Design a protein around this motif. Structure first.
Motif, PDB file in Angstrom:
ATOM      1  N   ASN A  71      -2.221 -64.441 -28.346  1.00  0.00           N
ATOM      2  CA  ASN A  71      -3.428 -64.627 -27.542  1.00  0.00           C
ATOM      3  C   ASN A  71      -4.207 -63.318 -27.415  1.00  0.00           C
ATOM      4  O   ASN A  71      -4.618 -62.917 -26.324  1.00  0.00           O
ATOM      5  CB  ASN A  71      -3.089 -65.204 -26.166  1.00  0.00           C
ATOM      6  CG  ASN A  71      -4.270 -65.904 -25.521  1.00  0.00           C
ATOM      7  OD1 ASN A  71      -5.012 -65.306 -24.743  1.00  0.00           O
ATOM      8  ND2 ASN A  71      -4.451 -67.178 -25.848  1.00  0.00           N
ATOM      9  N   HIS A  72      -4.386 -62.639 -28.551  1.00  0.00           N
ATOM     10  CA  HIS A  72      -5.157 -61.405 -28.694  1.00  0.00           C
ATOM     11  C   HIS A  72      -4.515 -60.210 -27.999  1.00  0.00           C
ATOM     12  O   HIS A  72      -5.202 -59.210 -27.752  1.00  0.00           O
ATOM     13  CB  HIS A  72      -6.596 -61.562 -28.184  1.00  0.00           C
ATOM     14  CG  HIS A  72      -7.269 -62.819 -28.640  1.00  0.00           C
ATOM     15  ND1 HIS A  72      -7.910 -62.924 -29.856  1.00  0.00           N
ATOM     16  CD2 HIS A  72      -7.407 -64.025 -28.038  1.00  0.00           C
ATOM     17  CE1 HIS A  72      -8.411 -64.140 -29.984  1.00  0.00           C
ATOM     18  NE2 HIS A  72      -8.118 -64.828 -28.895  1.00  0.00           N
ATOM     19  N   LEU A  73      -3.228 -60.276 -27.678  1.00  0.00           N
ATOM     20  CA  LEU A  73      -2.564 -59.228 -26.917  1.00  0.00           C
ATOM     21  C   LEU A  73      -1.519 -58.502 -27.755  1.00  0.00           C
ATOM     22  O   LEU A  73      -0.973 -59.050 -28.716  1.00  0.00           O
ATOM     23  CB  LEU A  73      -1.895 -59.808 -25.670  1.00  0.00           C
ATOM     24  CG  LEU A  73      -2.814 -60.399 -24.603  1.00  0.00           C
ATOM     25  CD1 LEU A  73      -1.993 -60.980 -23.461  1.00  0.00           C
ATOM     26  CD2 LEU A  73      -3.773 -59.340 -24.089  1.00  0.00           C
ATOM     27  N   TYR A  74      -1.254 -57.254 -27.380  1.00  0.00           N
ATOM     28  CA  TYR A  74      -0.081 -56.533 -27.848  1.00  0.00           C
ATOM     29  C   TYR A  74       1.043 -56.713 -26.838  1.00  0.00           C
ATOM     30  O   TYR A  74       0.826 -56.615 -25.628  1.00  0.00           O
ATOM     31  CB  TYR A  74      -0.383 -55.044 -28.025  1.00  0.00           C
ATOM     32  CG  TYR A  74      -1.245 -54.715 -29.220  1.00  0.00           C
ATOM     33  CD1 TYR A  74      -2.615 -54.935 -29.194  1.00  0.00           C
ATOM     34  CD2 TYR A  74      -0.690 -54.170 -30.370  1.00  0.00           C
ATOM     35  CE1 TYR A  74      -3.406 -54.630 -30.280  1.00  0.00           C
ATOM     36  CE2 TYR A  74      -1.475 -53.861 -31.464  1.00  0.00           C
ATOM     37  CZ  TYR A  74      -2.833 -54.094 -31.413  1.00  0.00           C
ATOM     38  OH  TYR A  74      -3.621 -53.788 -32.498  1.00  0.00           O
ATOM     39  N   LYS A  75       2.247 -56.978 -27.338  1.00  0.00           N
ATOM     40  CA  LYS A  75       3.381 -57.253 -26.467  1.00  0.00           C
ATOM     41  C   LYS A  75       4.577 -56.416 -26.887  1.00  0.00           C
ATOM     42  O   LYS A  75       4.949 -56.399 -28.062  1.00  0.00           O
ATOM     43  CB  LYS A  75       3.749 -58.740 -26.490  1.00  0.00           C
ATOM     44  CG  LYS A  75       2.675 -59.659 -25.929  1.00  0.00           C
ATOM     45  CD  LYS A  75       3.140 -61.104 -25.918  1.00  0.00           C
ATOM     46  CE  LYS A  75       2.096 -62.015 -25.296  1.00  0.00           C
ATOM     47  NZ  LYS A  75       2.550 -63.431 -25.255  1.00  0.00           N
TER      48      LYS A  75
ATOM     49  N   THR B 158       5.663 -55.831 -21.683  1.00  0.00           N
ATOM     50  CA  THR B 158       6.078 -57.068 -22.333  1.00  0.00           C
ATOM     51  C   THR B 158       5.046 -58.178 -22.177  1.00  0.00           C
ATOM     52  O   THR B 158       5.086 -59.157 -22.932  1.00  0.00           O
ATOM     53  CB  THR B 158       7.428 -57.539 -21.781  1.00  0.00           C
ATOM     54  OG1 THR B 158       7.333 -57.727 -20.363  1.00  0.00           O
ATOM     55  CG2 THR B 158       8.516 -56.515 -22.081  1.00  0.00           C
ATOM     56  N   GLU B 159       4.128 -58.050 -21.221  1.00  0.00           N
ATOM     57  CA  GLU B 159       3.050 -59.011 -21.031  1.00  0.00           C
ATOM     58  C   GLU B 159       1.739 -58.546 -21.652  1.00  0.00           C
ATOM     59  O   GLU B 159       0.702 -59.181 -21.432  1.00  0.00           O
ATOM     60  CB  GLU B 159       2.851 -59.299 -19.538  1.00  0.00           C
ATOM     61  CG  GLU B 159       3.909 -60.207 -18.926  1.00  0.00           C
ATOM     62  CD  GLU B 159       5.261 -59.536 -18.789  1.00  0.00           C
ATOM     63  OE1 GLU B 159       5.299 -58.299 -18.615  1.00  0.00           O
ATOM     64  OE2 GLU B 159       6.289 -60.244 -18.862  1.00  0.00           O
ATOM     65  N   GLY B 160       1.760 -57.459 -22.420  1.00  0.00           N
ATOM     66  CA  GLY B 160       0.555 -56.972 -23.062  1.00  0.00           C
ATOM     67  C   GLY B 160      -0.380 -56.189 -22.171  1.00  0.00           C
ATOM     68  O   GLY B 160      -1.546 -56.002 -22.532  1.00  0.00           O
ATOM     69  N   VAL B 161       0.090 -55.723 -21.020  1.00  0.00           N
ATOM     70  CA  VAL B 161      -0.745 -54.985 -20.077  1.00  0.00           C
ATOM     71  C   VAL B 161      -0.647 -53.500 -20.392  1.00  0.00           C
ATOM     72  O   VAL B 161       0.444 -52.921 -20.366  1.00  0.00           O
ATOM     73  CB  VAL B 161      -0.329 -55.270 -18.627  1.00  0.00           C
ATOM     74  CG1 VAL B 161      -1.165 -54.437 -17.668  1.00  0.00           C
ATOM     75  CG2 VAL B 161      -0.465 -56.752 -18.314  1.00  0.00           C
ATOM     76  N   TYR B 162      -1.788 -52.883 -20.691  1.00  0.00           N
ATOM     77  CA  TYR B 162      -1.841 -51.448 -20.928  1.00  0.00           C
ATOM     78  C   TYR B 162      -1.952 -50.703 -19.606  1.00  0.00           C
ATOM     79  O   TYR B 162      -2.690 -51.113 -18.706  1.00  0.00           O
ATOM     80  CB  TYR B 162      -3.024 -51.100 -21.831  1.00  0.00           C
ATOM     81  CG  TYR B 162      -3.154 -49.626 -22.139  1.00  0.00           C
ATOM     82  CD1 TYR B 162      -2.408 -49.040 -23.151  1.00  0.00           C
ATOM     83  CD2 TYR B 162      -4.029 -48.819 -21.417  1.00  0.00           C
ATOM     84  CE1 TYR B 162      -2.524 -47.694 -23.438  1.00  0.00           C
ATOM     85  CE2 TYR B 162      -4.150 -47.471 -21.696  1.00  0.00           C
ATOM     86  CZ  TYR B 162      -3.397 -46.914 -22.707  1.00  0.00           C
ATOM     87  OH  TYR B 162      -3.514 -45.574 -22.990  1.00  0.00           O
TER      88      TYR B 162
ATOM     89  N   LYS C 195      -9.598 -56.975 -17.568  1.00  0.00           N
ATOM     90  CA  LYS C 195      -9.858 -57.413 -18.930  1.00  0.00           C
ATOM     91  C   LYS C 195      -9.894 -58.936 -18.991  1.00  0.00           C
ATOM     92  O   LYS C 195      -9.171 -59.623 -18.262  1.00  0.00           O
ATOM     93  CB  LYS C 195      -8.793 -56.868 -19.883  1.00  0.00           C
ATOM     94  CG  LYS C 195      -7.382 -57.365 -19.609  1.00  0.00           C
ATOM     95  CD  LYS C 195      -6.414 -56.881 -20.678  1.00  0.00           C
ATOM     96  CE  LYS C 195      -5.022 -57.450 -20.462  1.00  0.00           C
ATOM     97  NZ  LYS C 195      -4.080 -57.021 -21.531  1.00  0.00           N
ATOM     98  N   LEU C 196     -10.760 -59.462 -19.851  1.00  0.00           N
ATOM     99  CA  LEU C 196     -10.913 -60.904 -19.962  1.00  0.00           C
ATOM    100  C   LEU C 196      -9.658 -61.530 -20.558  1.00  0.00           C
ATOM    101  O   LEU C 196      -9.061 -60.996 -21.494  1.00  0.00           O
ATOM    102  CB  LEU C 196     -12.134 -61.241 -20.817  1.00  0.00           C
ATOM    103  CG  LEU C 196     -13.455 -60.648 -20.323  1.00  0.00           C
ATOM    104  CD1 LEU C 196     -14.615 -61.097 -21.197  1.00  0.00           C
ATOM    105  CD2 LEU C 196     -13.697 -61.017 -18.868  1.00  0.00           C
ATOM    106  N   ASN C 197      -9.257 -62.671 -19.997  1.00  0.00           N
ATOM    107  CA  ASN C 197      -8.094 -63.409 -20.471  1.00  0.00           C
ATOM    108  C   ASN C 197      -8.432 -64.849 -20.835  1.00  0.00           C
ATOM    109  O   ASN C 197      -7.526 -65.631 -21.145  1.00  0.00           O
ATOM    110  CB  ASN C 197      -6.978 -63.380 -19.423  1.00  0.00           C
ATOM    111  CG  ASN C 197      -7.389 -64.030 -18.117  1.00  0.00           C
ATOM    112  OD1 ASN C 197      -8.568 -64.058 -17.770  1.00  0.00           O
ATOM    113  ND2 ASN C 197      -6.414 -64.559 -17.387  1.00  0.00           N
ATOM    114  N   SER C 198      -9.708 -65.222 -20.799  1.00  0.00           N
ATOM    115  CA  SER C 198     -10.160 -66.556 -21.175  1.00  0.00           C
ATOM    116  C   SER C 198     -10.973 -66.427 -22.456  1.00  0.00           C
ATOM    117  O   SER C 198     -12.048 -65.815 -22.458  1.00  0.00           O
ATOM    118  CB  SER C 198     -10.986 -67.191 -20.057  1.00  0.00           C
ATOM    119  OG  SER C 198     -11.388 -68.505 -20.400  1.00  0.00           O
TER     120      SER C 198
END
Lengths: 518, 105, 105, 518
Positions: free
Chosen positions: A36-40, C86-90, A448-451
């Motif tokens: 969903n466009h994220l780094y994890k 782990t949730e992608g939060v910087y 940051k946008l999440n939708s």
């Protein structure tokens, strides 16, 4: 260009010149939104891992990547047959890569029904790691490569990487890479992407099998001018010690002096495909050969290039000494032996030691009148001067190249899984759908946008590779061994589609059918 | 590569050998064939300079998070590390390696 | 000099203002002099790029002992500093200044 | 050149051109071995200090340094008299420095008797900190400068520096400097050293005293066109409140509007040289004005340029507001008032506030029918727009220049002790005798040598400075005040030698005798 104009044509063909063959392959790909466009951050804790040997730390990226590091991505079975039956060697020379006919789609779900429509203004981002600044994951035999069958549409694999780990935790030396910190081309439906790559100089792959063995290079008609100790005692009692010497000749070839010796070893356990010949115990992991790094044990797999088995011993294999491919439709976990294809390296038995045998025997004491001479089995042997060996054969469905690790030293950096080792291999090609935010709130919010609008992209990918050929100039009189299909009737044609349109590769195909002297 | 660390060379920097020329004391007034064993006690002093040009390989990492760096500790101490003591004695308090920056494998 | 820190300028980088052009909905078929208040609900998205060239003042210190340097800590932790969770939060775990090197007064 | 040839001549003279004066001075110096060729960490613990305000950390170096940062090092008393009586201003322009006639001596002690002989092969090392990479110690009024009398032979002061300290301990930010880590010229008896320096642009020093006061710049014959509130009540009872206004004119100059105001202040305590007018208590340190830095209190000394005393109040001085010079032969600790020379800045009373007075009075409340108007004494006042002031005067025996600290901001960086402030002042000139080891042992020992030949060096030093002059163009009719010697008979001539050959400076000489309008 424009919405209504194609940005490229379908190129898929093989051109055979004298000393060169040019392979072109085009495939249709689909790219979804990853993470969903994220780094994890990922680790064995996030995946539930417990064992120390399988602990890891890394990151999963929203980027995909293009992989064509398998031979069947470029060679059709007929082209592969021609290559292996008519050439003593081959190597890649240069590369051409193209992305075109980009199509970005938006997906909307109302109630249990999804509607797909074009989003002509959306973009897809592509860039190449030409400077090799990102972790290289193309050097592992991962799935997600271009399909062997040109008509198959494939899904782009998600890009991920691993860094230094202590259990499930990271250390200060661990690195985090943001792929948006790289310049990348943004492509709408009218744009295309292309680049060219030149392979660095690599040796030709040995697509031949030796017609002579390392221990049978002498003239079988002439004695040597060197002697050997034939006797030590006094034949036919006590006090019977007397030295003796004899000429090494055709009658005793085992004791003749030789200038070169077989290559290195690291003994594997022996497994029979006749199950009742194996021990009635669980010996997979325990009985396996391994190496250790920073307290973690990693399976010796496939390990040094060694002969799979002794002459006639076809039922046996080394426990982790050989590449294992899965047949079409084979499951992921705990499949039977008939569901997998076990490759073998019997062609290199002329120069390389047997994987399941000791290298040889070495003296372990000083013999005397009181102590009998003792010898010990050499279970692993390192490189010695005068050693010669053959590297592991490559296969139609096997890997092509790998990146040589950037280290101070290495020895014979041919990839152990087979292929060409390069300090600067073909660069990683990374692709991602640009996020398209949904309607934002009418009041400013700093988060940051999440939708985002649900999107995926599709298009065509073309890769052209020029291969240099090493022609055979053998003076052999009798006909050679050649790879051939079997004329006998069967329900399906090998390397073709089934009645349900499923393409299958029925067997692994090596490259070593022609012969040359040692 | 030298096992103790460094650069291995077939032709390394050559050995530089130095010696004080012997200065005989007063010899006897009658010839004696034996080599002289009476010399003026001497020693020499001077300055020595060596200049070495080193080539550098710059880092082009794309790593996002900051790297590990060698740094002195701000916390108060009786003496400054890599400096002289109250008696003028210079000391090196710890060995310093070269491997702090990172790159992929 | 700005009291919150930074560079004071009579002519700083200009303000860049952006707005979505209003798109009226269907107007009535009979003329009305009042300004339109029915608009199509719209929003816009895109990419923004800014490139800034910075001039550097290199250090020419004759200091013998090593300087204080900003460095990450090697000790193990659940997350890498200045990275995603782990949730992608910087997250930025600490403020970083600029004053680590030294010079005489 | 050679042993038997001089490497320079004795140059000591002053050349007076129209707008320029060139001063040349030559002195004979002696340089011993400092710290026995060692660097030593020093602190208040090593010196036995206890107070927090005097704690320090630093290093003492085996290097000496040349200092000529006092005016009498270049100007003879007669040249100084000419400069101050004939010029409205002056400033340094360029510098020439020379070291020559190097003589290195070795000292040998047998038993209670020392023998001195030449060591023709020994060297002396000299370099200039042209890049200002070392701590600058010439900005403090330290001893060890070139003597005012050309015939005096002086000892080169030892170079030392201080760094950041926490009590007697250092911190990680503390810096250690090795002066051998700098390129330096090595000179034998035949060699010489020289360099040239250009002074950066600085304002002319004010060698004049204002003939007008800041509060008396108006025409004493003409009224202003501005009014003032003369009355508030109803003169000659209750309910008597009525505003009033009057023209500000010659009869009331104190209330006239003015465009500019006197410069800043930081009040000092007042001390009488008539001891019975002072309080019967110990008030030196306690009663003194100070400033604080990182918890350490440093005396406000000499502080902002302020008038030393009110007209006629010559017996009083500010507790630490003035430069104090010692007479010839004066001791180091606890000397009487007649053994020191107290400078005064009465010439700047026309623009600068009195050091021992409040700046002025400021309203502290809102007056009303119930509350009487209140005012408060402004004991310190910062810079305000419209302020004008004069900097501290320079003296024949006072400092010449100082290095402006390398900081982000500063205001009017004129040195508070007097002189010219420069970002790039004349560089420090550091000199050291090269160590000459004694006989080493015949067996190798890795320890640094600690046995050296006892040596010292001597030679001549010449410095030439070109000064630019600002001539006076006054239209004043009556004669000016001029510095002059007194004809009345005395046992000795002022600024001359005594019967024992001791040169003395009997009084401090300023520069402000000529006058100009404000």
């Amino acid at each position: 260009d424009g919405v209504g104009s194609s940005s490229g044509n379908w190129h898929c063909d093989s051109q055979w010149l004298g000393d060169r063959v040019i392979t072109t392959s085009t495939r249709t790909w689909a790219l979804p939104t990853y993470n969903n466009h994220l780094y994890k951050q990922i680790s064995n804790s996030t995946s539930g891992g417990s064992s120390n040997d399988n602990a890891y730390f890394g990151y999963s990226t929203p980027w995909g990547y293009f992989d064509f590091n398998r031979f069947h991505c470029h060679f059709s079975p007929r082209d592969w047959q021609r290559l292996i039956n008519n050439n003593w060697g081959f190597r890649p020379k240069r590369l051409n890569f193209k992305l075109f006919n980009i199509q970005v789609k938006e997906v909307t779900d109302n109630n249990g029904v999804k509607t797909i429509a074009n989003n002509l203004t959306s973009t897809v981002q592509v860039f190449t790691d030409s400077d090799y600044q990102l972790p290289y994951v193309l050097g592992s035999a991962h799935e997600g490569c271009l399909p062997p069958f040109p008509a198959d549409v494939f899904m782009i694999p998600q890009y991920g990487y691993l860094t230094l780990n202590d259990g499930s935790q990271a250390v200060g030396r661990s690195s985090f890479y943001c792929l948006e910190y790289f310049p990348s081309q943004m492509l709408r439906t009218g744009n295309n992407f292309q680049f060219s790559y030149e392979f660095e100089n690599v040796p030709f792959h040995s697509s031949y099998a030796h017609s002579q063995s390392l221990d049978r290079l002498m003239n079988p008609l002439i004695d040597q001018y060197l002697y050997y100790l034939s006797k030590t005692i006094n034949g036919s009692g006590q006090n019977q010690q007397t030295l003796k010497f004899s000429v090494a000749g055709p009658s005793n070839m085992a004791v003749q002096g030789r200038n070169y010796i077989p290559g290195p070893s690291y003994r594997q356990q022996r497994v029979s495909t006749t199950v009742t010949q194996n021990n009635n115990s669980e010996f997979a992991w325990p009985g396996a050969s391994s190496w250790a790094l920073n307290g973690r044990n990693s399976l010796m797999n496939p390990g040094p290039a060694m002969a799979s088995h002794k002459e006639g011993e076809d039922r046996f294999f080394p426990l982790s000494g050989s590449l294992i491919f899965g047949k079409q439709g084979t499951g992921r976990d705990n499949v039977d032996a008939d569901k997998v294809m076990i490759t073998n390296e019997e062609e290199i038995k002329t120069t390389n030691p047997v994987a399941t045998e000791s290298y040889g025997q070495v003296a372990t004491n000083h013999q005397s009148a009181q102590a009998q001479a003792q010898t010990g089995w050499v279970q692993n042997q390192g490189i010695l001067p005068g050693m010669v060996w053959q590297d592991r054969d490559v296969y139609l469905q096997g890997p092509i190249w790998a990146k040589i690790p950037h280290t101070d030293g290495n020895f014979h950096p041919s990839p152990l899984m087979g292929g060409f080792g390069m300090k600067h291999p073909p660069p990683q090609i990374l692709i991602k759908n640009t996020p398209v935010p949904a309607d934002p709130p009418t009041a400013f919010n700093k988060d940051k946008l999440n939708s985002f609008i649900t999107q995926y992209s599709t298009g065509q990918v073309s890769v052209e590779i020029e291969w240099e050929l090493q022609k055979e100039n053998s003076k052999r009189w009798n006909p050679e061994i050649q790879y051939t299909s079997n004329y006998y009737k069967s329900n399906n044609v090998e390397f073709a589609v089934n009645t349900e349109g499923v393409y299958s590769e029925p067997r692994p195909i090596g490259t070593r059918y022609l012969t040359r002297n040692l």
